[PDB]
Paper text:
The nuclear envelope partitions nuclear components from the cytoskeleton, thereby necessitating their mechanical coupling across the nuclear envelope to enable cytoskeletal function in the structure and positioning of nuclear contents. This is achieved by the Linker of Nucleoskeleton and Cytoskeleton (LINC) complex, which traverses the nuclear envelope and binds to cytoskeletal and nuclear structures to mediate force transduction between these partitioned components (Haque et al., 2006; Crisp et al., 2006; Lee and Burke, 2018; Meinke and Schirmer, 2015). The LINC complex is formed of SUN (Sad1 and UNC84 homology) domain and KASH (Klarsicht, ANC-1, and Syne homology) domain proteins, which interact immediately below the outer nuclear membrane, through complex formation between their C-terminal eponymous SUN and KASH domains. Thus, the LINC complex axis is established by a peri-nuclear SUN-KASH core interaction and mechanically couples the cytoskeleton and nuclear contents. We find that SUN-KASH complexes between SUN proteins and Nesprin-4, KASH5 and Nesprin-1 are 6:6 structures formed of constitutive interactions between two 3:3 complexes.
The SUN1-KASH4 structure was solved at a resolution of 2.75 Å and revealed a 6:6 assembly in which two globular 3:3 complexes are held in a head-to-head configuration through zinc-coordination by opposing KASH4 molecules across the 6:6 interface. SUN1-KASH4 adopts an unusual conformation in which the 6:6 complex is held together by three interface spanning zinc-sites, each coordinated by opposing KASH4 molecules. The presence of metal ions in the crystal structure was confirmed by corresponding peaks in anomalous difference electron density maps, and their identity as zinc ions that were co-purified from bacterial expression was confirmed by the spectrophotometric determination of three zinc ions per 6:6 complex in solution that were lost upon pre-incubation with EDTA. The zinc-sites are coordinated by asymmetric ligands from 381-CCSH-384 motifs of opposing KASH4 molecules, comprising C381 and C382 from one molecule, and C382 and H384 from the other, and mutation of both cysteine residues to serine was sufficient to preclude zinc-binding. The three zinc-sites form a tripod of interactions that provide the sole interface-spanning contacts between opposing 3:3 complexes. KASH1 undergoes a turn of >90° to radiate from the trimer axis, similar to the previously reported SUN2-KASH1/2 structures, whereas KASH4 and KASH5 follow the arc of the SUN1 trimer, enabling them to contribute directly to the 6:6 interface. We confirmed this hypothesis for SUN1-KASH4 through the finding that the 6:6 complex is retained upon zinc removal by pre-incubation with EDTA, likely through reversal to a KASH1-like interface in which the head-to-head interaction is mediated solely by SUN1 amino acids.
Residue numbers in the entry:
A (entry chain B), D (entry chain C), H (entry chain E), I (entry chain F): 618 to 811
B (entry chain I): 380 to 404
C (entry chain J): 378 to 404
E (entry chain A), J (entry chain D): 618 to 812
F (entry chain H), L (entry chain G): 379 to 404
G (entry chain K), K (entry chain L): 382 to 404
Write the structure that this text describes.
């Protein structure tokens, strides 16, 4: 327990450096994931972050759904949609059997308003066989706990047949009380390739 | 803010799409 | 290959300015 | 006692993942903070980082004051002003009672010259009631120790009237000996919202 | 051993926050490092990451050699060249005596294909006195272990009269079996600057 | 997605960074 | 290819807001 | 008869150089005229003139309604709208009492198809008091003769109350047989300013 | 004789206004003509007309082969190729039987050097059935007279079999003595459509 | 008598087609002429011709001094300077001995206001050896007649030494009564080149 | 809005640095 | 004006016009 204690700290650091989970994120944009923007909710328009150049105002900056599959989860590095109900369709990097999903949101200790009421509360994950499929196959129905850790994992449902999926839809049903919008910081898809 | 009602262009969204499989990883 | 010269085409170095004019962004 | 060891390392990693402090940074740009470029020192221009495209030199790159409220603190991800005296005005994300300030600089073990003479040495923090206020209320005079840790925190002064502020001015009075410029990697503002 | 264990974990985190090594990376771009694009291999063409704006397709995105001297090592943040043989020339931030080199690659547990066969296997590091020098002084020939840790360090060759260098060439001789390309995530150069 | 078969979409624009006046502020 | 990247024809609009131009 | 001949030819050249009419064109764009692009018919879409740069196709080129108040009347320098019915509203350079109108079209001897069936046949001219007025005051109804000269002038109707106008609407009711579109090369407005 | 004189001068002005020839120019760009850029010689590089904006040099301006099928023939509105031998391939607006060709060059009285030695001297016109054809059917070999008028017309050869063409190649074999380049101001193609 | 008449009409059209003068315009921009932009007057700012794209206002359009050496002289195709006093320095296409100058303005019958009071009235032409020369050699003091023809030509002054020039300055001293600006449609320089 | 995005009215300047263009 | 003798000022950008769907409106 003298040298073993150093082995635990190095193992914890090794797991922390491996995207904090040590599992492949088939939704990660840099690794092959992509957003099907034509099947996502309308981005919440805020019109506050004014980008200018040489004193010339150019445009207002707002985060796109792409940030949900990007690792930077500092406060604000999140995609927001109007209301408490939204959908996000992600094309996975490979055709996999989905096994688990990961949702990340900032802790209460880092939010300026002192709360994470913009975080999603009730959501479901679906598997789509093609881009144009309206109703997909239910992969699971979960609840993100605001009193839990920042990173929360959710085990996918065992589908009866060995049906693979490369397109995933994230349907948010409710948030934690924010009356205007709902923010998604990062959404990950884990599983086994075919 | 140039005046009371300013014609600021719509928020630009640079979209990334994978059309030929995996990128080099 | 690389740059064919060391003189910049743009005289002054640009700077993208970010200013909040309508409150907080979504967090 | 293996579970106690895992609990200690996991608690340290949890605090490390929460911006290394577990406290709200009301100056963070992505969270709502912004730089008042009208009331900042002129950026030290070096004209060394030449950006080119198709062999055509386009412009020289230099970090703006925006990076001081951005988390990346790798060597070079810092705003520099000429000399050893400079000022930086930041608009906070919310109207808060300032309680502490955080200054970050690269350690000597990561600096190419083997020392951090560009780091600020003596500074003071002021609270401004409006953008055009020439003289603000002194919130505290501190000294960044070059022989200290990379991240250093400074407790704000206790004042009779706890007047709140949404605009903070960072006045650098001296550096640690660099004859050309002074670098600021990250400056954070912590407190309690109204 | 309780307070000592807290000292151990805090010391480990301190080394972790200092670029995971606590040593100066004279090749880091933000710190002064730069890529000599002419003296580097051609980028592997994939034409898959289609960048569009307002529905207008603009160009296909591919990582340039610059990312190799950038810290972000998430899967995909790597420069790839065709085949298993390539060369990367980096201009160091300062004239230094090279002492060690660091090569980083993603672990197999984060690769979508389940393997890191695109990682380099056999490589060598050379020291160049000028940009136009074809073949420089050999600083060390090493082998990146696919079964080793993600970050691997390599000690430079010892020499009696230490000649300094500000330009280093990384020559990849083989990969771990990928038939198309070879990926480099991050390459670091460590040493002592000249007085 | 490409509009037609073998749309001639240009290659990657490569922003080159070169240091011509020594070290940047660090 | 023959498909235009921009869907509609880029049309520069000219409007007089402060009277006559110099003639 | 020698000096008489030269004086006649010089007078003809003098009238030719003065915009072929020697009369003010209050609709001319360079002189103060402008097209109310909102109050015009939808431009006929052809998608044939592919503009490219470095082998990259950029856009298809089509003439805007602005060309109708521009003097260049070479074949193709005309604005076309789908069908045989179209509207064109022009804001005059000055508040004038309209007295005559000029319509120009290419001669058949310069048309590639061997006909000028795309030219307008029956049209009317209206006077509008404001921009958003739907139905204006009728200034005249005329017919462009396909067998006449390239430039044809039409005298406006005399009115009891001399009401001035700075906005004119050109309504094309029919063409000379072209089944696809109708082309307008140049439309002029003549009168006396207030 | 006054009415006879007015009819003579008005007929001359009518022919002058109809592109100075009263004949369809099936090579005119605005009317449907286009240049095959891959089937033309390289433009003579001068590096003298420096275009700048806000003091920033942008590029050197040189006329492309497109101006040859544009009506503006003021001095300088011409495409130049290196040497005294060059090729220009034009796609006609319609499939026609070529009957005549027109070559235009500035008069000596408008040239700064006092001569038109950059003008072409010996040339030939060929008809191509498709773009991929290398050597086409000879439509005529002519000589532009430097001592002649600015506009010179050339009748195509008589052919027993009536073969139509929509692609024309203009081959310049020699100029009028300019040692550096050869300039083409305007080239027209006349004929009867099918 | 008929062939003589047709020869007269063809001669008039031939002279008309040759830039209406049959003389070389060494100031013509497309032929080699250029405006020395620094050595000019301040352009009259009107802020009325708003150029927009997709409903986004981009900039206000105003004619530059370049239009003075461009042939299009339709109403509005003119450069305007504030007041009734202005300068225009033109670099000729070749080193010539100046013999005549041409000033063009729209006729009164084509102006919307019914007058050409914005036209220049009294002017002088000078020859400069370099761009930075403050006061040059007087080539002629002339007056543009508002009651004359649209195109008016002026013979250069007979000087004892036929000194050649490649830089010409046009000094406008007065206009025909416009209280705000003065418009120049086209200014031409004629002469004989050096050999 | 009616305020121009570019404060200066733009102006493409043409200057001849290497003699005559092809005429 | 150019900055140095090694300055690579580009040549004429050439906007190419091609007719791919027949005649334009005439
Ligand atoms: K994110
Ligand atoms: K920073
Ligand atoms: K990297
Ligand atoms: K027109
Ligand atoms: K031409
Ligand atoms: K003009
Ligand atoms: Zn405004
Ligand atoms: Zn296509
Ligand atoms: Zn230069």
């Amino acid at each position: 327990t003298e040298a073993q204690a150093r082995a635990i700290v190095n193992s914890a650091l090794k797991l922390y450096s491996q995207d904090k989970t040590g599992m492949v994120d088939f939704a990660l944009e840099s690794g092959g994931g992509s957003i099907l923007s034509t099947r996502c909710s309308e981005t919440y328009e805020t019109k506050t972050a004014l980008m200018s150049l040489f004193g010339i105002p150019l445009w207002y900056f707002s985060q796109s759904p792409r940030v949900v599959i990007q690792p930077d989860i500092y406060p604000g590095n999140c995609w927001a949609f109007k209301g408490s109900q939204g959908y996000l369709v992600v094309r996975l990097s490979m055709m996999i059997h989905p096994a688990a999903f990961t949702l990340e949101h900032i802790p209460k200790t880092l939010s300026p308003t002192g709360n994470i009421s913009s975080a999603p509360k009730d959501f479901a994950v679906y598997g789509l066989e093609n881009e144009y499929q309206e109703e997909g196959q239910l992969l699971g129905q979960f609840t993100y706990d605001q009193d839990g850790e920042s990173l929360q994992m959710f085990q996918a449902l065992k589908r009866p047949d060995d049906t693979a999926f490369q397109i995933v839809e994230l349907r948010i049903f409710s948030n934690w009380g924010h009356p205007e919008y709902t923010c998604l910081y990062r959404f990950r898809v884990h599983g086994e390739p075919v | 803010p140039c005046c009371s009602h300013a014609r600021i262009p719509r928020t630009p969204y640079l979209v990334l799409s994978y059309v030929n499989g995996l990128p080099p990883v």
